[PDB]
Design a binder for this molecule. Structure first.
Ligand code: 2AQ
Length: 377
């Protein structure tokens, strides 16, 4: 699996992408890896921000499905024409599969100006595929047409330029330390899971765990932030605010309406609490916990045209669609998407950014009762 190590690149805030090829002869594209959606969708037209795009006219293996897709999302949309064609992942297994491809012919606030990716690879399940659950996701086509085991794993490192690994079909033990712990995938639509308890610094929020998952908790490599429901967010910030009373910050900072900064090489780590999410484990009444450092929830703003300091953002933020465990969480851990066993595995990442005080940790087992009550209905 070492042939797939270091096959993800990116830039801070602009997600992680993997190199892929489409059609015969192979057209190379960079495609964002997104466990929060389920469509393989790629630029098929010369939008000025794109570096390259799918040119179907060049592909002998292309086939039109004679049907469009329209995908709206909060302030934005992409829109396109469905077909299938031959697909390969040069630094992935040595297969070629026939997959659905949405040729994006029109979009709005989708592509990023200055990014180096031209497509999105939805690794989530058909249930949330568009236009409907019959459009077979890439990964399902990959597994169904090859002997590639039904699992992939993600090591998101990040630093500027970022990097990582997507190991398709297995686990590489060089990318983690200690032991994998697994939490069930509650339903195969998003990668849904259940947070059963939450602790800032060690003290916990004593909230009806059900709130931690209102209406959802997901693992999502497409989102940057740890995103929490509103009550949970307030409760959470309120407690981070208190722990970190050694200094004073704008109130709108916590709300991500303002950046905050310290002089170069002068960031106060230890004024910030570790955050621990207890996830539902594999056995009744058994949980484990994942703990991230402030280097995970405090991420540098790459460049500020009107500044010259160490300006971080606060990477924790409200939400209406549930908890979303994005790069903030995933960059601390090696994450295993064990689709064959309806479960997601967490281990301390061999590359998380750690100091000489604290470390990202995955620990268990713990005894937690009534873990099902934490799921919303
Ligand atoms: N994971 C994720 C979050 C937001 C999206 C918006 C549009 C397409 C895909 C997305 N995936």
């Amino acid at each position: 699996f070492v042939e797939m190590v270091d096959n993800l690149r990116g830039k801070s805030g602009q997600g992680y992408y993997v190199e892929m090829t489409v059609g015969s002869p192979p057209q190379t594209l960079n495609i964002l890896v997104d466990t929060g959606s389920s469509n393989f969708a790629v630029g098929a037209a010369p939008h000025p921000f794109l570096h390259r795009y799918y040119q179907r006219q060049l592909s002998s293996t292309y086939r039109d499905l004679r049907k469009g897709v329209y995908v709206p999302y909060t302030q934005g949309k992409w829109e396109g024409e469905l077909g299938t064609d031959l697909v390969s992942i040069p630094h992935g297994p040595n297969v070629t599969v026939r997959a659905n491809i949405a040729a994006i012919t029109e979009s709005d606030k989708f592509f990023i100006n200055g990014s180096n990716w031209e497509g999105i690879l939805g690794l989530a399940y058909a249930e949330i595929a568009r236009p409907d659950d019959s459009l077979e996701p890439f990964f399902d086509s990959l597994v169904k047409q090859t002997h590639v085991p039904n699992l992939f794993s993600l090591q998101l490192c990040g630093a500027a330029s970022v990097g990582g690994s997507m190991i398709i079909g297995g686990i590489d033990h060089s990318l983690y330390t200690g032991s994998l712990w697994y939490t069930p995938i509650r339903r195969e639509w998003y990668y849904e899971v259940i947070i059963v308890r939450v602790e800032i610094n060690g003290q916990d929020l004593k909230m009806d765990c059900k709130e931690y998952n209102y209406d959802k908790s997901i693992v999502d490599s497409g989102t940057t932030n740890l995103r929490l429901p509103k009550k949970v967010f307030e409760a959470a910030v309120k407690s981070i605010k208190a722990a970190s009373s050694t200094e004073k910050f704008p109130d709108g900072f916590w709300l991500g309406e303002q950046l905050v900064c310290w002089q170069a090489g002068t960031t106060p780590w230890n004024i910030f609490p570790v955050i621990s999410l207890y996830l539902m484990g594999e056995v009744t009444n058994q949980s484990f916990r994942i703990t991230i450092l402030p280097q995970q929830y405090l991420r540098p703003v790459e460049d500020v045209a009107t500044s010259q300091d160490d300006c971080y953002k606060f990477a924790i933020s409200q939400s209406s669609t549930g908890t979303v465990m994005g790069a903030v969480i995933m960059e601390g851990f090696y994450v295993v998407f064990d689709r064959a066993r309806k479960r997601i595995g967490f281990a301390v990442s061999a590359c998380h950014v750690h100091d000489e005080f604290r470390t990202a940790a995955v620990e268990g087992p713990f005894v937690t009762l009534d873990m099902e009550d934490c799921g919303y209905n």
